Write a protein that binds this DNA or RNA. Structure first.
Ligand SMILES: Nc1ncnc2c1ncn2[C@@H]1O[C@H](COP(=O)(O)OP(=O)(O)OP(=O)(O)O)[C@@H](O)[C@H]1O
Length: 529
RNA sequence: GGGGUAUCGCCAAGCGGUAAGGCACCGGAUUCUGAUUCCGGCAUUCCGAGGUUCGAAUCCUCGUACCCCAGCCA
């Protein structure tokens, strides 16, 4: 329960409403991100919790910033999270004729006029945050005059910025938004849905409340920056012949630590090619998060945890990571892979190898097991062997013995160094009666696999508050290794999380893998305590 | 000038009857993943100072801090 559900509860109880109809209205000018996933969870969750409806509506009022590529991807990520909208996908452009009729009602009532103050002047006349504005000299044109000028606008007789339609409200209102807000502006741009049918386009505030009213939305839920806007939401509905009047309720937007959400910015990372694109595994986008190896279930959980309040806030990545870990620990089948490897040969070994039956899940016998080939000449992780180390160190020291994962208790003996003092190979003994744990991969049956170690994109917690967020990008956000994995990883499917034991949960990058060379993105590391 | 918000390091519940929960953190037990699981510790205190009350985070003053708004963006 949250403050919005308590409102919805009262409404139902008092008999204000019988059903609840919410909506998610992204503008199609970019890919959805983790913050959007919070609206999706809120809006679609309430609908299904109350057996109500939730429309997916593309708020497509600004043609020059939107593109058809985003509509298809948005529908894509909404479904992926496991949510379905009510009926058909809707578009604000679906209401362009309605919106136009409504502007006319306003004009006929004298509550709107065609102003000719330039784009620079309108700002000058608007006042400031402490100084009231002033009426444009074009404010008292006759209704008959406004209809003519508006139709001329509609007919493309005015150049961009040469005229716009404004609401005749209050230039001295303490709400900057009520200072004669623009309702329509001229843009000679092709619209991704309406082609070149329209050269005048409605502004968010005029389009949004009328669309909600037409769709019979009972509660418009948006973020806190729209609290002021709400006054205009109600003013529009109060002055046009519409039979319902939805109510807006604002909650606080999600801010994730170490990442930026501003689509303007995310777009710059993609435009300047600093990431591979919107679905780069370092991006806070839903598709990026998906390619990274997250699961819709881990995200819905994240939403459940962070809550819905009016408080500004900033979640730590630790909270997000906790979610995916919890999910993958349960459902991810374990496997073996070595990221940085140094060869290890057991001399006391007899035979061209053998087979070790390893389980697909150490805490869930029900998941089955597999035949992992064991051998004498294997591959181990460089950071697992140490010539000298204290008690704490519970791995392979040049002195004692260590257990190979589900195999034999080997025993370090000699080490063969390369010219530059680097260990090239290790020599050890073992006693076949055995069967300090480390992971390994039989060199003979090792599958060369590229591993991508992803880290946080930025090196400060609020790169948003930086003068130049770009200069604060983490150069180690992606570190590419070459390692080896047990041959079973040959059958991995894109987006199927595996837990490389003692490393983390990884998943096959569908975008870079092939036949010989598979690419694995590291979703999240283990609790490296 | 106006509109909001103030509860553990980060989220968050509480709606006059005496501070839930989660992430993180610290221990202690188990463990062929320094993982998982288990055990326990984690706000006499709710931005501050004063009021009312038997009892206030919650009600009342009176301050303080932060966030939002001046796109023909959403
Ligand atoms: N960080 C966020 N946290 C919660 N809800 C968000 C967040 N960002 C956007 N939303 C929600 O998603 C809805 C659709 O957002 P929309 O795509 O229209 O714009 P935006 O993403 O907020 O802005 P921009 O295009 O500049 O990134 C908004 O009405 C809002 O409720």
């Amino acid at each position: 329960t949250n403050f919005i559900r308590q409102i919805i509860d009262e409404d139902l109880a008092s008999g204000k409403h019988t059903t609840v109809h919410t909506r998610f209205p992204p503008e199609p000018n970019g890919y959805l991100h983790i913050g959007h996933a919070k609206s999706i969870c809120l809006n679609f969750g309430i609908a299904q919790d109350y057996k109500g409806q939730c429309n997916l509506r593309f708020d497509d009022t600004n043609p020059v910033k939107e593109d058809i590529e985003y509509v298809e991807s948005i529908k894509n990520d909404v479904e992926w999270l496991g949510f379905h909208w009510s009926g058909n996908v809707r578009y604000s452009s679906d209401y362009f004729d309605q919106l136009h009729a409504y502007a006319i009602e306003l004009i006929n009532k004298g509550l709107a006029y065609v102003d000719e103050l330039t784009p620079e002047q309108i700002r000058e006349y608007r006042g400031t945050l402490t100084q009231p504005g002033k009426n444009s000299p074009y404010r008292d044109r006759s209704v008959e005059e406004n209809l003519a000028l508006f139709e001329k606008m509609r007919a493309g007789g005015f150049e961009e910025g040469k005229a716009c339609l404004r609401a005749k409200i209050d230039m001295a209102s303490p709400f900057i938004v009520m200072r004669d807000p623009v309702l329509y502006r001229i843009k000679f741009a092709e619209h991704h849905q309406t082609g070149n049918k329209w050269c005048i386009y409605p502004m968010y505030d005029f389009t949004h409340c009328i669309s909600d009213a037409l769709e019979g939305i009972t509660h418009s839920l948006c973020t806190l920056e729209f609290q002021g806007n709400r006054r205009l939401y109600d003013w529009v509905l109060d002055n046009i012949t519409i039979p319902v009047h939805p109510r807006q309720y604002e909650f606080s937007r999600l801010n994730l630590e170490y990442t930026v959400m501003s689509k303007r910015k995310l777009n710059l990372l993609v435009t300047d090619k600093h990431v591979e694109g919107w679905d780069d595994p370092r991006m806070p986008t839903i598709s990026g998060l998906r390619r990274r190896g997250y699961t819709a279930a881990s995200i819905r959980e994240f939403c459940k945890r962070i809550g819905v309040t009016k408080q500004d806030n900033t979640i730590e990545m630790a909270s997000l990571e906790s979610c995916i870990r919890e999910d993958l620990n349960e459902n991810a089948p374990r496997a073996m892979a070595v990221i940085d490897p140094v060869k290890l040969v057991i001399e006391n070994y007899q035979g061209e190898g053998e087979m070790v039956t390893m389980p697909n899940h150490p805490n869930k016998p029900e998941m089955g097991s597999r035949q992992v080939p064991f051998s004498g000449e294997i591959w181990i992780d460089r950071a697992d062997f140490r010539e000298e180390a204290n008690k704490q160190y519970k791995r392979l020291v040049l002195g004692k013995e260590v257990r190979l994962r589900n195999a034999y208790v080997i025993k370090a003996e000699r080490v063969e160094k390369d010219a530059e003092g680097n260990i090239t190979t290790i020599f050890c003994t073992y006693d076949a009666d055995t069967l300090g744990v480390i992971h390994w991969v039989s060199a003979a049956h090792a599958l060369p696999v590229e591993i991508r170690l992803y880290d946080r994109l930025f090196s400060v917690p609020n790169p948003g508050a930086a003068d130049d967020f770009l200069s604060v990008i983490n150069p180690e956000s992606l570190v590419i290794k070459q390692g080896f994995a047990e041959p079973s990883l040959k059958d991995a499917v894109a987006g199927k999380a595996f837990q490389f034991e003692r490393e983390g949960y990884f998943c096959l990058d569908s975008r870079h893998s092939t036949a010989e060379k598979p690419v694995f993105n590291r979703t999240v590391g283990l609790r490296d305590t």
